[PDB]
Symmetry: D2
Subunit: 465 residues, 4 copies
Amino acid sequence: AKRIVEPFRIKMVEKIRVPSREEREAALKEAGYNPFLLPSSAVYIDLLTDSGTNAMSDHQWAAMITGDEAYAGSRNYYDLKDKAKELFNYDYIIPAHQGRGAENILFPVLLKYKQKEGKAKNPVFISNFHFDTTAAHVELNGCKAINIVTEKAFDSETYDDWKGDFDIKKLKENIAQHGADNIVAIVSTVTCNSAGGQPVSMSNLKEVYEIAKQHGIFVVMDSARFCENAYFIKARDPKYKNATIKEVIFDMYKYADALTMSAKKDPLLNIGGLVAIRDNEEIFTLARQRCVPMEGFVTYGGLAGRDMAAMVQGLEEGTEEEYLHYRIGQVKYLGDRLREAGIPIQYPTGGHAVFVDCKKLVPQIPGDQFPAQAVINALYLESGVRAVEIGSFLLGRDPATGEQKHADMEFMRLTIARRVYTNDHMDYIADALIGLKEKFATLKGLEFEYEPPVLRHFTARLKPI
Amino acid sequence: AKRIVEPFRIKMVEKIRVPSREEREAALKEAGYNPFLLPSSAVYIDLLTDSGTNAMSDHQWAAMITGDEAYAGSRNYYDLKDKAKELFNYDYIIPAHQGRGAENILFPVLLKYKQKEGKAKNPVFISNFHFDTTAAHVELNGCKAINIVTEKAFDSETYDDWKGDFDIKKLKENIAQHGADNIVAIVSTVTCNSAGGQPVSMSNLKEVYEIAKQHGIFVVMDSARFCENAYFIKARDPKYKNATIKEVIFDMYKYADALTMSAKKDPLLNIGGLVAIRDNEEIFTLARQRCVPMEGFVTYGGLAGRDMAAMVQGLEEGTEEEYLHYRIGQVKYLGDRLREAGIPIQYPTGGHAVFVDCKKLVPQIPGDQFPAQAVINALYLESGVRAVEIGSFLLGRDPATGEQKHADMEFMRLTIARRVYTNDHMDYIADALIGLKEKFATLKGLEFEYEPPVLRHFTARLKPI
Amino acid sequence: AKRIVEPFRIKMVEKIRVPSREEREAALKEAGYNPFLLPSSAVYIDLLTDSGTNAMSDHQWAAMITGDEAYAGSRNYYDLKDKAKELFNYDYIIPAHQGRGAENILFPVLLKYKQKEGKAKNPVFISNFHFDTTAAHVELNGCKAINIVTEKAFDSETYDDWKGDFDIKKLKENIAQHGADNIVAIVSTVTCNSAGGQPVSMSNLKEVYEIAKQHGIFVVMDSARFCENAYFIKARDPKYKNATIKEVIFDMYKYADALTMSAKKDPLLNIGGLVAIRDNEEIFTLARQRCVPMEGFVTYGGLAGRDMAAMVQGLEEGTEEEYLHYRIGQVKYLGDRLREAGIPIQYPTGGHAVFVDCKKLVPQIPGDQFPAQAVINALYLESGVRAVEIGSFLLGRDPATGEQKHADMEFMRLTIARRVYTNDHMDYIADALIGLKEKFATLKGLEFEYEPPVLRHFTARLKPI
Amino acid sequence: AKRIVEPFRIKMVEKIRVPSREEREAALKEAGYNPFLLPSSAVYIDLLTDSGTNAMSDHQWAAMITGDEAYAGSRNYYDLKDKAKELFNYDYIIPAHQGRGAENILFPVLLKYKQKEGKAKNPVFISNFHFDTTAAHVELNGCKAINIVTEKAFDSETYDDWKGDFDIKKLKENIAQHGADNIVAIVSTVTCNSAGGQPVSMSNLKEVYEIAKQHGIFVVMDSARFCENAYFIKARDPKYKNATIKEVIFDMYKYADALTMSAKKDPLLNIGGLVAIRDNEEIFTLARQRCVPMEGFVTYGGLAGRDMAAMVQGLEEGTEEEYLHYRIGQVKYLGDRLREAGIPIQYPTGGHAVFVDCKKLVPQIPGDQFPAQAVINALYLESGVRAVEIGSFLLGRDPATGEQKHADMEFMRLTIARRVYTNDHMDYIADALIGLKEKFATLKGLEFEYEPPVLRHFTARLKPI
Ligand SMILES: [K+]
Ligand SMILES: [K+]
Ligand SMILES: [K+]
Ligand SMILES: [K+]
C-alpha cells in the first residue's frame, strides 16, 4: 500500500472527536441501529458520502467573499458561463442548487421535447448505471430507467481497467427492443458511481455517442465525478498518456449533448450544481422556463452568488492532476490496506470510495437480515466511523411479492470526501475493520422495528436479532 | 420625510459605480431595453428585489465559518429545528434551498393528501394574494389560484392600516362556491407582497384560520416577510402595543398549520428556505419523501451547512425591533420623499418596497406600450438605478386571443434590500425620479424587438417607439 | 450642509447600541471621568480616533484569506514593495506593525546617521506639526521636537486653503539658530493632524524640500493621511485641477527622502504600518537592522501576511477619488451642521475630523480645569458618543514649573473612521452637540482623582468640580 | 517510528508546489545560495520556523470575524485579560504585536526598576538559554545575557528527560559572582528553545524561583512554547501523570513573576504577543507607559481586535492534550525516521523541531565553509524543503578577534509549524535527507559572494567552493 503526499498544506482545521464506546452504543440505539439517523456529533470519521463535505481552498473562500449576490446578471454567473465554455465547449448553462436540481430541470424537458414530436409513447432512459436521484427523476416523470453497465463490473475481485463501461451489445439490443423513438436520452455516468466509481473509457463514451447519433438519441453526461473519470482515462488509456487532464475532459464532452452535474463532488464544493447544454438552444430555453419555478431566476439557479464564485474556482482546482493523483491514490491506499489483510473489495478501487463485499465477511447472515448493515453497525460501535450500505437493505422489497428483493452484492461503501482526511485517518479506518476479523463470525443480523413504505434506507429503525 | 439612523455600523463594504451615461445608454441599448437582462456591472443602485441581496452581520458570517457540512445530522439542522420551535412553536422542519423549493415540496403533498380522502376533484388554493412562484406551483399541480385581498388594497392613495387583509366575505363565498372538499389549502401571505408589502392584521389571520378549521381546510402561512408583518401589527394594533416582536410572531403562527418561507427575505440571507409544519406528522412524512429527490437529504434540504447556520442567526436578527423600525422607516422615507414631491405611490408604504403608479406620470403612453417600463428605463438612463416593472409587460398576453391583458395598475416597484443602502442612497433614487418630471411628458412607449411566449419580462427585447 | 452619497453599499454590518443614561453615568464614573478608560460596550458612536477602526472592503477581506504567512519571502511583501514603488516611486520598504513602529525603526537610525558624521551635537527635529507619537520618539532619542505650522492654523474661524503649511520664515530662522548640522530631519506631516487635519500645499512641500536640500537635511513625510492631503491639493490648487489623485500623490513624494506611515489611517486598515525610503540604501540597511529586534523579520515587520495583503489593496482603495470626495464631504457635512448652528469649529474642516473650539463654548472654564474635556464628558453623558480632548489635559504639565502648561487651543476632536458611519450617524452627533448649547455656560470643570506622572491623558482618573 | 493520527480534519487547504529541479537550481542561485532570502514561492515545504505559520481552526477564524476593533476598551482585550487570569493566575496583561514587542516593553522597564533602587550597576540577565531576540533586547539595554543550561543539553545522542533545565550550580555561582543587586531578572525559557526545544522540569523551575525569591530577583517566564513544555512535564514527571495540561500550566506559573510570550508559537496564531504580570502593579504601570509609544494604546498593544479574539481561542486550543500529543508525536515521528536511518539528531526530540548534526554527515567541510548550510542547500535542491542552519554561518565572527567564530555545533533545524503538514510531508522530508546519504560525501562547502556586517545569515550571498 503506498501513501501519496498531499500537494497542499492545511490552512484551517475543524476539530473531530471519538465518542466513547458507551456514547456510541447509546447513539446507535437512539438512531434505531441506522447510522443515517445518527447526529454528526456522534461520528468521528464520516464516510457516508463524498457529497458536499469536501474542504475548499483559500482561493475558493476568497472568491465567496467577493461573490456578487445580484438577483439578475451576477458577475459570477458570467464567469461560470465562460468556465463551462472553456472546460466542455458547451455554450449554454443553467446553475442549479445541486445535482438532483439539475436533473429536475433537464429531464422533464427532454421527455417533453421527445413527446412534442409524437414520439416517446413508452419512454425510457438508458444509462451505464443511473445514480439513485437520476433514476428517481426518470421514474417520477413516468419513464423507465434501464442500466446496462458491463458485466465486468459485477466481478468484484477481477481487475479490469474500465468497469464503468456501457455493455454495447445490451445498448443495441435495448434500442431495437424499445425503439429509438422511445429512448428519451442516454445518460453516461462518469465515473460510474453505482458500479463503485469505476471509469468509463473514452472509446466506450465515443461508441455510445456515435450509436446515439445514428439513431437521433440525445446524450446527457451525468458529470458529478468527471475529473476522477478523466484521471483514470489519462492513467490507463495509452492514447491519453501525455495529455493534460483538461485535454481529456475536452474530448470526453465531445461525446454528449448536455451535462447534469452535482458540483458537490469533483468541483470541491459544499453545495452547487449545473446544467450545461452544448448547442441546442430550444432545450436550453425550455430548461430555463422550468428553472424559474423550481430552482430560481436563471442567472443564479437556487445558488448564492458566493457559491457560483466558489464553483468557478472549484471547477479549475478539481482538474489539477497533482491533486487528482493524490486524491485517488488515497482511496487506493485504503483499498490496498484492506486487500492486503484479506478483506474483499471491489478491485480496482474507483475514484471516491472503497466498496467492501460483506457477503464473504458474514456468511451466517442471510441477505434479508442485512449483512452489510450489520458490518457497518459493528464498525461504528468499534471505531466511531460511519459508513453506508449498498446492499439488500437499500435494495428494498419486490412490489409484486412484498418480499426482500434479491441482492447480488452486500456492499459497505467507505466514501471519501476530498481534501478532508489524511492517510492516518485512512489507517484508522483500515485498522478498525481489520480488527473486526475475529468478530465477524459472531455477528447476528438485524430486524425491522419501523419499516417505512418508501426511502426505507434513510429512516427505517432496526434492531439486532 | 423622517430619516431614521442605523442601529448598526458598517463592517464591510462593496464598491458600486454609476456607469457613465453613454455606458448606461450602451448597456441599456445592448440589453434590448429590458433591465432584467442587464448585467449587475451596468447597475448603480439595484432595486429589482429585496430577495437574497441583504447584508449579513459579522455574527452571521462567523456562524457560516463554523457551519457543519455533514451530509446527515448536521449540528446546524438541529439548531434550526430548535429555532423554528422557539419562534413558531412548530415541531417539524424541512430545510429548502429557497422559498419556491419549499413550495415545490409542500404544495404537491397537500394536493395528494386532500385527494387521498377522495376530495379535491376541482382543486383550488385560496390566498389574500398568491406570490408569483406560489401561484405557479398551484397551477403546475393542476389547481386554481384564487386571490381575495381586501378591496382597500386597490385604493392606492387612501390610507388603511391593513391593506393585505383577506376579504372575509369573498372567503366565505369561495368556500360555498367551490366546496371545502375542493379547497386544498388557504395560503396567508404575510406581509401581503402583491398588494405592496401591506400587513395582514392579527384579527384577520385569526378569523381566516377559525373559518378554515370549521371547514377542515389546511392553512399555510407564506412567511417570507413575517417580521415586517409582525412589526406592523405591533405598530398599528393597540392590543400588541406593549408586546415584543417575538410575542407577536408567536401569536401569528397559532393561525396556521404550516409555513413556507423564503429565508432570502426577512431572515436576512442570500439563499435559503424552510418548510415548518406545526403538528401534522403525516404531511411532514410525505413532504420529506418529496424533499429527497427535489431538494436533497432531509437534514440539509439543498443548503450548505453554513447557510443553515446563517439562517439560525438571521431568524434571530430579523426579529429585532430596532432593526425593523429602521428598515421599515427607510422605505417610508423614500415613499415620503416621493409623495411630498407629488409622485403618486401606494400609501401607506409596505415593509420592503415603494410602489409608484406610472399611469399618472406618462398618460400619453398606453398600457400596451409599457408606461411603467418607460419610466423604469428613463430612471435607469438618468441614474443607474434598476427598478422593476409590475404592469402590462409583466401581466402578459391572454392565450385565448393573444391579447395584451389589461393591467388595472402600471406600477414601478422600488424594492429595498435589507441593511444595504443608506438614506442618502434613498435620496439619490427619489431625486433622480423627481428630476424626470419635465421629461415624463416627452416619454414615448416601447415596442417589442423580440418577444418570447413565456418569461417575456425576463427576456423580451424591446425598443422605444 | 450637503450630504454626499456613498460610492459603495453595505456588505456586512456590526450591531451598535445606545446604552441608557443610567448605564452611561455608571460607566463614566467607573472610568474616572475619562472616556479613554471606557469599555467599547458603553459607547454608541465612537469618535475617539480614525485609527484602525475603518471598514474594509470585500476585496480587502478576500486578500486576507489568501495572504501568505511565510516567515521570509511572503508573496505579499513583494506586492507591497511594488505598490510603494508605484505610488511613491520609492525603492525600499520595511513593513511595520503600525505608524509608531515605523517611527521607532526610522528615527533612531536618522539620528545615528547624522551623528556618524560628527554632527547632531544638539539634535533637533523640525515639523509643521509633530503628531504625538512622532514627538515622543524624537524626545525618547534625546532630541528636540520643534513645530512651525503657519499661524493661519490658530485662527479657527478664518478660512484658509492651507492651514497645515510650514511657516517658511520660522523654518529659515530655526536652521540659522540651530545649524543644519543639528537638524536630524524635517518631518512633513500630511495632512497636518495636530492643526485639525489641514492640508499642506504642494508648493509649501516643495519649498520646504528645496530648502532642506540646500542645507543637506533629510526629509521624512509622515504619511498617515496622505490621500486626504492629496484630495485637498487637487480640490484647492488650480495646478492640479485636472490631475488624478495618484498624480498628485506621485508629485508630493518628490519632496521627501522617505516616509513613515500609519496604514491604520488612509490605507483603510485595522492594523499596519510602513517605512519606505526613496533611494538611500544605507539608511535602509540600518533601518532593517533595527527592524529585526523591534518589529520582526524584514519581510513582515510585525504584521501577519494577511495584513500586508490587505494593505496592498487598501493603498489602492484609499486613493480613489469618489471615495475621498464622499469621505471628506461627510466630515464637512458634520462641520457645516455645527457651524450653521453657531458651534465654533476649526474652519475649513480637515480630512478626518471636526475640531470644536471649546475655549469659545466654555469661557467659564479655565484650561487647568479642562474645558474641552468638560465638553466631551457632557456630550458622552447626553448621547453615548465618545470623543477625544486635544487641549491642555493632553498638553500636560510643564517640566520646569510642574503646573498646568499653557494651552493655545482647547479643542474637542470628533474623529471619523472611514466607511463606518452614515450621514444619519453624523446628524445624531450634530444634534446631540447642538442640544447642549444652553448647558455650556453652567459646565462645572474638572479636577484630578488620580494623576499619573506621564501620559496622564490616557489613564488619569478625574472628577467633576 | 509511530505515526499519530490528527485529532481534527481539514477544512481549508492552501496549495503548495514542488518547484522543478531546474527552477529549484535557478531560484537558489538567484537567492545567492541562501534560503533566508528565497521568496516563499520557490519553497515546497517550509521548515524555517514554527513562528506564525500555524493553521488556525474554524473557531479562531470565526472569532476574528466578530473581533472588536475599538481603539480603547475592545471586548477582546477584556476576554484576553480573563483568559490570562484563568491560565496563569496573573492579574495584569499588556498585549503586544509579537514576542519581541513584549520583550521591548518589559525588559527596559525591569532594568529601570532595578536601577531606581540604586542597584543594577553592572546589570545582567540570567537564563537557561536566552532566545535570539531576548538576548538582543538584553544587550540593547546595556546588559549582559548569561546562559546556564544544563550540560546534558550538549550531549546530543544521550537521552535525558530534561535537557532545558537550568544548571543550578552555575546559577548560584553567577549570583555570587555578579551579586543579586546586578541581576535584573532571571528568564526561564520554556521549552528551552536554543537547546532544541527541550523541556524544563517543574522541579527545576521551582528551585530556580525559590533561589530567585531569596535574593529578591525578578523572574520572567519566556512562554512562547509553554504548552509543549507542559505536555513534557505531564509525560515525564510522575507527579503530573494524572494531571490535566491546565493543571501543569497553573503550577508552572507559580514559579515566575511575569511572562513574555510570542503568541505566534503555542497559541496557534499568525501574529501576536503578550506581557502578563502576576501582581506587581508598579511594573505593570511602567510597562504600560512604554507600551504606548512602542506598540500602541494599552488595550490593543499593536494588534487588531480580531487578533486578540483569535488569541483568546488559540490559548485554549493550544492547551488541548489530544492536540499536543499529536503535534509532539509528529515531531518525534520525523526524528525517529531520521534516527532509525542513522541520521544523528538531538535526542530526544523537543516540542517543535528536529535538530540534525551536519558535522557528522559531511566531515569534509570545515565550519568556516558551512557544513550545515550545504546540507540545507542540497536538501533544498533535492526536495524543495527549506530549513534553517544553526551553526557557523549563524554564529558569526568574534567581536575582538573578527575571525569565523568556533561553532560547537553545525545543526540543521527542521522546524515544524502547528497543524499544517501531515505525516506524509514528514516522510517526504525524512526520505529527502535519507536519500542524500550516498551523495553527502561529494559535498563541497561554501564561501561568501557578499557578506554583510551584522545582517549575515538573513542577507549574505554565498557560492559553493
Ligand atoms: K454540505
Ligand atoms: K443571492
Ligand atoms: K484596530
Ligand atoms: K505570519
